[PDB]
Write a protein that binds this ligand. Structure first.
Ligand code: ADP
Ligand code: ADP
Ligand code: VW0
Ligand code: AH0
Lengths: 363, 363
């Protein structure tokens, strides 16, 4: 019954997820701890997601504040759980993606794991993505293995679907190796648009999206990106799908209401997920939705209707809160590293084969 | 009787040292292998040593080339020694420093250890300084503990003096715990000056230096830099001692012949060493010189003259070739990581205490 911490901080930059798990015969969630991202740090992370000056100095100092916050949250969670650091075997830390360039064969995650070990007094397993990339893979997604271990079922063809900043799906097909790929944007554009407009961080329950009307021509134009055509191992991020990208599409088209664009963005996510998922697993019987997109009532409804042959529900029904799936997954990967068990799925990432993912920074 | 690889590429940027050692009852050098740094790569690393644009993307691509070259070298050495990589327990990789800012509490060594593990098929231990910096230390020097393991003679006092781009000394005073610090510039300015003048990489045997004559006024002004005044834990780099820095001193005084300036730079190194060393260890009886500075005949004689109470010889006289000392140290630090033994020295670095240095990237 070794206990592990998982630290995830996704591209939505909403905040830091910290989970505690017990890894026995099955993965149990013991506790969760959410740290909202400070305004300043969120914006400084966003400033590192595009090319710019003095990045090495800037990232180091952003890194220091990120780790300091992570260690604060870990300390908080342990005290509130009446357990010491000694009772935790290791922290699994994803870090923070500031650049993802699989075409150029690199992915950049910050989160100085040495400093995280020093501050927490706990062994840290981190930097899980770079060995997969080194093995020719996309480096993303890395949860499918975990999704397999949780929800691997012979009797059903399940698709486990994360909807964070970006969407990604794990295809659990009886008989066949685990498949998976980034579907496209999840909340990233819906958040970015309501931020450029107005100045909010996200659209609660997708209520602003539901107030507007879809523009079918715009939808067509957005779906005409090369990434949606591509199949098999692929990944994406803020490099491709961002506000500039959207504005470039809005330029050639005429002027539309802002809510209609938001509605179009919701549909863009629903349709990209639906069509890419159903292309890969037309036999799908259950879509299990995790990540913060699970809480979007407008989005979830649309997925159910665009995939009528499937039962679309969040992972809550199956015992695991959708908020903490990624955090639990990286806790699990620290386990996998310490037992020398493969981290990646080759037919997900496109790597040469299975690889032990991560590096060990001991306390 | 495990075998380790040591990989070191210092601030001189002359090339990559690859050593193979055995760590039985003591450290034995089995083989060495030097890789001249390609011109293109040397200049791109140098371009990352000052603030600039698009550093994260640039550093990543430079990193891949660095690692590709390191892996090539490792392959070449093993084949030439008729060895499988199965027979090597791990590689200790220093990586390549492109920024050293202890004051801002960060230091940046590139060398994607995950890719290095991928390409060599051997477990990599890397990223040694960061944990010392995390512990409130300078992060440099890191060799003193090795120096103590090799040349820890209690009957006699002695200082082990590495002269690379930068000079650093390990003070081995019988009974008293190990101390050390960066003395200042070793070859870095002498290299930088002749490069600026003639394009050459270094001054062979200090012949150019030896053809010129020391200028008193310039020397005084060079010795005036505050770094030389400071005592105890120190570290420095190209951030302080560089050609721009030198030219601030040149401009102040009238024009000098180029060779006289070179003569003066040789004197600057010897005096900053000799005075910092004996200040901290006045009883010094022996100066074991390692690093490429040991090959500078003019420098070695001048060190002898300034320190006549002690013998000044290279480490070759006591078993170890002066070129491979650092490479051997990092292989040793791999051994020290894997046994969970401290690799830093608080009374050298200023860190809160003894720490395991490095991170394990398994093959
Ligand atoms: N009640 C909600 N209604 C709609 N969207 C929501 C709601 N709560 C959270 N979200 C979305 O979930 C996102 C966070 O999802 P998350 O899984 O943390 O993504 P990431 O891992 O990329 O940070 C927010 O940016 C937001 O768009
Ligand atoms: N024959 C020589 N004569 C004088 N200086 C030399 C000679 N060979 C090497 N050097 C000096 O040694 C330096 C390399 O020393 P090294 O120990 O590799 O330092 P670093 O760790 O900074 O790379 C060169 O830059 C040069 O100044
Ligand atoms: C941050 C950094 O890169 N420091 C190095 C450091 O290198 C050696 C390996 C050490 O860690 O002890 C040393 O202080 C000095 C002289 O050694 P070399 O120039 O021969 O490498 O160089 C640089 O300051
Ligand atoms: C490079 C990167 O950070 N990718 C993220 C991102 O956010 C969701 C999706 O794109 C996924 O591929 C991945 O995160 C999850 C945890 C994963 O690796 O499965």
């Amino acid at each position: 019954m070794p206990r592990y911490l998982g630290l995830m901080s996704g591209t939505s930059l909403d905040g830091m997820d910290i989970v505690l798990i017990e890894q026995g015969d099955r993965t149990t969630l013991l506790a969760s701890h959410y740290l909202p991202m400070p305004a300043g740090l969120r914006e400084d992370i966003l400033a590192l997601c595009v090319p710019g000056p003095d990045e090495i100095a800037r990232a180091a100092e952003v890194e220091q504040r990120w780790v300091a916050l992570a260690a604060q949250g870990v300390r908080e969670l342990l005290l509130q759980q009446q357990m010491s650091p000694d009772e935790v075997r290791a922290i699994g830390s994803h870090g923070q993606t500031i650049r993802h360039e699989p075409a150029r064969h690199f992915t950049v995650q910050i989160g100085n794991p040495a400093l995280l070990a020093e501050l927490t007094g706990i062994d840290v397993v981190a930097d899980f993505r770079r060995r997969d990339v080194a093995a020719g893979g996309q480096g993303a997604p890395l949860v499918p293995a975990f999704h397999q271990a949780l929800f691997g079922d012979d009797d059903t063809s399940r698709a486990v679907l994360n909807i964070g900043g970006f969407s990604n799906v794990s295809l659990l097909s009886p008989g066949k190796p685990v498949r998976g790929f980034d579907c496209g944007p999840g909340n990233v554009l819906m958040d970015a648009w309501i931020h450029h407009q107005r100045g909010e961080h996200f659209d609660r329950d997708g209520a602003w999206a539901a107030s507007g009307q879809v523009n079918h021509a715009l939808l067509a134009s957005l779906l005409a990106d090369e990434f949606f055509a591509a199949r098999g191992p692929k990944s994406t991020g803020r490099e491709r799908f961002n506000l500039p990208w959207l504005q470039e599409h809005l330029a050639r088209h005429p002027a539309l209401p802002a809510a209609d664009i938001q509605a179009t963005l919701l549909e863009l996510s629903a349709r990209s997920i639906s069509e890419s998922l159903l292309d890969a697993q037309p036999d799908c019987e259950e879509v299990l939705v995790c990540g913060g997109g699970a809480f979007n009532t407008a989005l979830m409804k649309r997925l159910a209707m665009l995939m009528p042959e499937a039962r679309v529900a969040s992972t809550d029904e199956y015992g695991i809160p959708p908020a903490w799936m990624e955090g639990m997954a990286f806790a699990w990967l620290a386990h996998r590293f310490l037992e020398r068990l493969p981290g990646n799925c080759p037919d997900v990432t496109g790597a040469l084969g299975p690889r032990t993912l991560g590096a060990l920074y001991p306390a």
